[PDB]
Amino acid sequence: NEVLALLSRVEAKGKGILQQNQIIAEFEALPEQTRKKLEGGPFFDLLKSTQEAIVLPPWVALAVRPRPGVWEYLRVNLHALVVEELQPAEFLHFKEELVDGVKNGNFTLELDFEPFNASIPRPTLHKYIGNGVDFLNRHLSAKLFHDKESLLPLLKFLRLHSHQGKNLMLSEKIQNLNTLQHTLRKAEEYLAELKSETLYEEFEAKFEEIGLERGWGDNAERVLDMIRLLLDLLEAPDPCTLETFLGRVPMVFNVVILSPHGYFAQDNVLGYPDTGGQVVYILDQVRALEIEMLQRIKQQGLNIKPRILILTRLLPDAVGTTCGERLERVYDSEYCDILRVPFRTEKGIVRKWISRFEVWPYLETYTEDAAVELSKELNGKPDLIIGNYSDGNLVASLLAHKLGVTQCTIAHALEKTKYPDSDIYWKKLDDKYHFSCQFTADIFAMNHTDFIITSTFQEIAGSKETVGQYESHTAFTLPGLYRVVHGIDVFDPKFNIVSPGADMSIYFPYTEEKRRLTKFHSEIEELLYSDVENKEHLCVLKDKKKPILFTMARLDRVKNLSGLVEWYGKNTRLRELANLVVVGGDRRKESKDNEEKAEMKKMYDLIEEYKLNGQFRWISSQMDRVRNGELYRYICDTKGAFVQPALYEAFGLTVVEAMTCGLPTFATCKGGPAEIIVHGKSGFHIDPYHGDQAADTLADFFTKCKEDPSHWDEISKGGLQRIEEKYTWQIYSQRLLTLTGVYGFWKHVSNLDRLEARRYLEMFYALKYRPLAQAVPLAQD
Amino acid sequence: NEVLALLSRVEAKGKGILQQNQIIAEFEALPEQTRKKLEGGPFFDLLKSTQEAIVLPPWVALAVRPRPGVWEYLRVNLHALVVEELQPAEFLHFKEELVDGVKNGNFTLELDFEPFNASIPRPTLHKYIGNGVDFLNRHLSAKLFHDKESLLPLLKFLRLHSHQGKNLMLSEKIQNLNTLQHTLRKAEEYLAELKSETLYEEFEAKFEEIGLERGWGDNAERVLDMIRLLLDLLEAPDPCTLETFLGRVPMVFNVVILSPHGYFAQDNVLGYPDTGGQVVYILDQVRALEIEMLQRIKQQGLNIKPRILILTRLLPDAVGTTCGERLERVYDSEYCDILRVPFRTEKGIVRKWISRFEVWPYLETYTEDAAVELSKELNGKPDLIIGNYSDGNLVASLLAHKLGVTQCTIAHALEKTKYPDSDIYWKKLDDKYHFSCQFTADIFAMNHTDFIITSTFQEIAGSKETVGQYESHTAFTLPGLYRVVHGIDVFDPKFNIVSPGADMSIYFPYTEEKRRLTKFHSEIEELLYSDVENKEHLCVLKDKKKPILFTMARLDRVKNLSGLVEWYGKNTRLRELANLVVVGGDRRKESKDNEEKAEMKKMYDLIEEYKLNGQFRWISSQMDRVRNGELYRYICDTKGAFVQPALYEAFGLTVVEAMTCGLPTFATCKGGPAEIIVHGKSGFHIDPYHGDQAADTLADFFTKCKEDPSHWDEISKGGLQRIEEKYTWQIYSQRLLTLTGVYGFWKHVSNLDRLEARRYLEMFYALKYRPLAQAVPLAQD
Amino acid sequence: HLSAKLFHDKESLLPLLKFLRLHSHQGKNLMLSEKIQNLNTLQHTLRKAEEYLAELKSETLYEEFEAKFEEIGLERGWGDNAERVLDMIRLLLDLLEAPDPCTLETFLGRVPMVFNVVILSPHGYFAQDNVLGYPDTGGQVVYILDQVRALEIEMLQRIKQQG
């Protein structure tokens, strides 16, 4: 039936040459179509699952996403009955024509990682997405089952394994699978007799003779399960055994964590440009991690002192902060230190703060210096290196290569999703955002790392209707630069979802009075309710008795706080039900940041346009997490809500913070918060793209709550439970240390195939990144 | 020898910080040493296998070459007993350090092709160097043996195989090994009944029913052997069967040869800058190749008209030549044409000749234009593409990539060997030679091609004492640009030695009188013996009865004609015995080539310095091979000899020409002629680095010949038999076409592993070659 | 099939090494000595041997180089003279590198192996005269008599040629 499909198509052309999201997609076409739709049926789905249509005049190219991870591309005539199948490169061809006027030059670069990944097969099942360590365990387990050449790497691994001059596991005496099999069995028999609680020092003497070094356990009971696991791996390997053994072998002692950009510190930084949850995340991470490391070290019978170093930039001139000092102890830990190294050039060190978009030229030299410094602090090399965001992941990759260390990366966000069509439009965006440098770093670190941690499933594969953050890096193009035909694969065994949490000492339910910090209420009240207008707070709240609609964030475009302010301003119904309180930007000082500056001006104007004085209180960055905990609980007291109107949010720690304090939450459905909140149960989703519907949705909530206050309680409890179930730090660290064990081993087994990819990546860095980065204009002191 | 060994190192530090070459790095050290040698002990063996030694402060680094293609690097302490093994990358550090003062940036490019080549096992045997098709034959032979997933590709090959819309071998009626097996047997039974001479047309009707298309053979007999061959590969594959069948399948019809630089023509060219044996080789090659292709096509029962196209630059302003016409029939062929295409920029075409060292920025646009043109000429696409030298290989690679055609490359020379230390010292050489472009292209094509042809073993692996031309490319560095850790491997199965020849109608023994061309004797005598001095010839021969010491060649630095002149000028013994005649340079015109100009100035000076008038005749470029043949023969008449005093010579076609006419030849021991000539038997070696001995050797030969004239005749016969045995064109074409058969099929089997290497090279071209080439300044018309 | 199984499989070559390693007759060792425990050493030894031999005149008798070979792990049975010892060592190198059916057959054919042969023909009246035509006594007896004569000649020929 061609009279119909041509209906939609002729409507497609009516739009003119440009990109169209499924946002528009059928919006303009199928629903916006005349009642003649009468479709359902075939070709409705094909269009329903269409992620984007690139429309140029004769043709429209369609990218179709049947399942997460599965993609087919199609060209169909604007006027015709014809439908042809595009190869990914060919569809990327369409995009390039839409922008440059021409497809990229014949011999212009195609990035393809697919042929480099043929080492392990790949899962086709939705269940292994973000689950890759499970798949890997099952592959290793099989590859290991009665293969002498397969088991050897394990023996060599345990044989060479050591820390700070001291030998661990097997000694040099065990040279072959037989001797090992024999020693284990002999050792098993000896211990099987002894009392469970016998300390390793008793049988230490005996073990050393037969070739066993320390780290099997603190006492005989533990050592026995350990030695039995290994006998089991040499006999009949299965995944649970494998994972347990590898996760248990003490490995991680010295950890190195990379976060170069922003002002990274424990006080008076939160909410400055570039300074946000990534800092909050890491500080929570190290503490949870140190606790777990000590625990492990002890259990395996070791006295080793751990060290965790967070490498960031030293900022000499940032005053009111500790950013200018080389070494800083992380609060509430023995072994975690922030290590700070300066950016520098041939001219000497660079003093001023630099935006995260501008740091690229300094990253390589930073890697060199960082290597020297961490090497002065550590005893022995790093056992694990974790990259964070783009610059951190970049540096993390170089260091891991340099030092021969298991690497992990964490994106914390991927700009390509936050700035829609920033890939295809990169050129016009480059003087400002330098996304050519950044998308290069990302693609690079993504493939270079050993394993990857994400905060949610959606960060990888998205949902049924919409594409994930990484998934969107599978096929893209930067016209005039290069074309990524397969840049990453959602099914990659290196992806692991491990969810973060909020420090439970800082954020707890507002209902526990014993724990409420009331010593903060005077300050909070001045902050919320005072009549003073200054750099700390703008306008004033007329009625202190209303519920408060609250948000807190860095102030930039994507965070879209000026959007919220507008939605709020237009809607009389909502302004009547609730006061709007927004924490963002720091007005105490001169903003050096582009987006922030821009956003500040919009805020001012909105205040005048919608005459917001008396309903609205605009607060400066709140840098003390302890008082913030209380602030959230205070919002609860007023029976209000948290709202997060980001155009895109990669994860959203404040969403978790609010829910954890019992504050009912309305969060953007674009990005992580879609997975975090279960609509109508643990909170509500709103669409930043329809803000008036958002404001009405909030007005609705507050109206119901007024009629039936128990409505409020439902959501509050809903959120509280959701957090308890999904996001908390206890499991995280154990999960991470286990992945490091398994991926660490897999490194040596898979070492020979990754050799080509290693060289390919080295060249990409050298001949693509470096030149791009050197083109970025230097900061001038 | 804690005493003795320390002692050599002693002298070593003497020469200071510098390059240590075997001659220097031994001849000085050990022979300028004392009787303290007593060196028939072990340390001398590793000592004399040292190819070069990097002299620095207290360390000296040694590259050691026990056997051809086997290298180990190490560092010894200048004053110390300690010697520590070095990785290839580390050895190359030293060189980088000795020049720039620092190593290359830690993260700057390191090329390693090793991991990309693992597809096949590699021969460790000297015997397989240059023999790789024999090796690939045994790999495929084995991979093929009772493996179904293995045999399918061969069936897909034969089924898909067609030319110009005409099906060949198997039709679509054969979908699987079972039916193929069944059909062949059926065909066999039928054919064995018929008379041997039965033409394919008779049984064609039947063959088409059972799925057999044309190309098995012209008669019953031949069709029978081919069918039996294939049945064999389905049953018991062996290397000989495999090779023979693959060589027999009609494949090569359209052939494209790439030779952009020089003035490429059939007359009024040879001896111009850049115009040389490459032009000669190619013209002979195509003729030989056409005769074989026609042969094959006939034998396999086909009427196809073949085409061979030689692609070169169109030069509109080169007068006296055919170089400005687009299409030129090659003398003595029906199907071979020269196809010229212009260089151009956005500004339009570029008219003026450009030195082979400067062509780089034009090649990519050249490739595009050339694809358009050769597409107009060919009916169907190229079945084979052959690259020639650096530019030709660069373009051939782009083409084969673009058109999906089997690719061969032929180096014809590798400048890195011709210009010692031009890699390490490349930077100061670059404004003139652009070796950064060239070496990049060479490494690029070298790894990109399917198979490589060389003219001699030495060209690949050299000798026991000296390093091969390609081999010298295994590990090197260009400080400040990049470093090649493994760039090529002498044991690579793609290397094939296929030796060229001299056209036998042009060059033949001086003793066959019926054939001598006497009508040229008037001209020749004027050339050598006349008293006129002009741009055609300089100075004069006083005594017409002396033997002549003859050389002919392009005039450039490496050809070292000026060296010969000096050796001759100094040596009174030789001047007395013989007249020196040198053909090189075209003085008829004003030289546009740097080295030529430089070299002319020296020649003039040498004439006056050594007062060469009356013993010396300097002749301008002799451009007609027909008379040239007679020229050689005329030298023989005088009982003279040929001398090739090159500092390095990649092959030496003139050596073959000379030997083929019965002219006793003295050729440089550096490069190819070392293999061509067997000293004392088929000719003599001379060392351009000791020139005075060169002149004495010549002197000795002439002296002995004066005493015993049969000495001359002895060497003459040596040369002739030598040529007869090794270098002739008859075997060449068959060899080439069999290689295409075998490497063509290998393409389809090995396709998946070379996919990784394909991306690596693609990225290397894009990100390394293009930027370099775009930096070479353009010619200005 | 052997040519294939043999191509670049270490595990698959070991059998060949062991074969030539144990091979001996009447207490005298043949081919490889006990000195060679692995393929790398054999590779190296065969290499060294080839090099040494290539220099000596074709007609040089084994005893000359017997001393050296003994040193490096090479026992007798390679050939009578240098020329033949050379060809045989090359064949073996070839099998270690790129095994093919012709080379395998040729090398295994040439290894001195068969010395004592035992032939079974129990029934009939088996003899050289006054037998043929008797019950059960016929072409089989004729066959075996011709057979052994021919065999003996070839065996002597082979034994001599292998040194």
Ligand SMILES: O=c1ccn([C@@H]2O[C@H](COP(=O)(O)OP(=O)(O)O)[C@@H](O)[C@H]2O)c(=O)[nH]1
């Ligand atoms: O003015 C501010 C702005 C942000 N934050 C904290 O910074 C983190 C922001 O993390 P999130 O993931 O929500 O946003 P991000 O900045 O990382 O994109 C949360 O802990 C906030 O409570 C804060 O304490 N004061």
Ligand SMILES: O=c1ccn([C@@H]2O[C@H](COP(=O)(O)OP(=O)(O)O)[C@@H](O)[C@H]2O)c(=O)[nH]1
């Ligand atoms: O003035 C000259 C110089 C060279 N030749 C021919 O050019 C070829 C030179 O090839 P060769 O391999 O000897 O040196 P190349 O120029 O390739 O380095 C030979 O056929 C020579 O006879 C010639 O005919 N006239």
Ligand SMILES: O=c1ccn([C@@H]2O[C@H](COP(=O)(O)OP(=O)(O)O)[C@@H](O)[C@H]2O)c(=O)[nH]1
């Ligand atoms: O009276 C006889 C009968 C048989 N023969 C020989 O016995 C052999 C018979 O062998 P054959 O293969 O013909 O048949 P077989 O007896 O072995 O079944 C031949 O060499 C005959 O010459 C013979 O010499 N005299």
Ligand SMILES: OC[C@H]1OC=C(O)[C@@H](O)[C@@H]1O
């Ligand atoms: O850590 C979570 C946040 O961090 C940093 C970002 O840019 C946000 O989009 C994320 O949600």
Ligand SMILES: OC[C@H]1OC=C(O)[C@@H](O)[C@@H]1O
């Ligand atoms: O290959 C033919 C000639 O071409 C180019 C050269 O430099 C010579 O050495 C060769 O012999």
Ligand SMILES: [K+]
């Ligand atoms: K150990």
Ligand SMILES: [K+]
């Ligand atoms: K076919």
Ligand SMILES: [K+]
């Ligand atoms: K033996």
